[PDB]
Amino acid sequence: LHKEPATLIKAIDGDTVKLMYKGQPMVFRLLLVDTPETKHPKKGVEKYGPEASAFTKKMVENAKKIEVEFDKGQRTDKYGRGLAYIYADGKMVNEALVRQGLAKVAYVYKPNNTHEQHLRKSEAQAKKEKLNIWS
């Protein structure tokens, strides 16, 4: 896995950001994580949804450098969104959300699972500290 540069366009939700990647706007879904959402019917704005969404937004809006890292498997989902690990100045956003109890590790589809154990470890630590989702 290699990182590639990208430029923020807009944060959309806790688990989705719009980036300029190789000169084209593209929606990216963060791999391996489920945040509570602000944008989904039935529910609408779930609990900790605004919080997860504000966390991702600040983190990418205050970064100097954004990098995307695709995994080994498919790089887009059925909605056209890029599937990737997103980094803000060296720090993985997917992991930060998980470590803060603002996301759960999703159901995993091999082979897009390279960072799975690392996230699962952060998730185990956030439950132990009973952070947010886990409180």
- Technique used: X-ray
99 is catalytic: no
Domains, the chain, with CATH or none: 1-135 (2.40.50.90)
The rounded distance, in Å, linking the Cα atoms of 45 and 130 is 22
Cβ distance 46 to 37 under 8 Å?
A: yes
Q: How many whole angstroms separate alpha carbon 94 and alpha carbon 2? A: 16
**35 in a labelled binding site:** yes
- Cα separation, 66 vs 80, in Å, equals 20
Pairing mode, if any, of strands 24-30 and 33-34? unpaired
81 is catalytic: yes
Residues 6+ apart with CB under 8 A from 61: 8, 11
Q: Write the DSSP assignment of 19-65 as a string of letters.
A: EEETTEEEEEEETTEE---SSBTTTBS-TTHHHHHHHHHHHHHT-S-
Which resolution in angstroms does this entry have? Answer: 1.7
Decide: 55 and 102 in contact? Cβ < 8 Å.
yes
Dihedral in degrees, nearest 10, Cα atoms 74, 44, 63, 17: 30
User: Which position among 51, 67, 81, 95 bears the catalytic label?
Assistant: 81
Structure token digits, residue 53: 């969404």
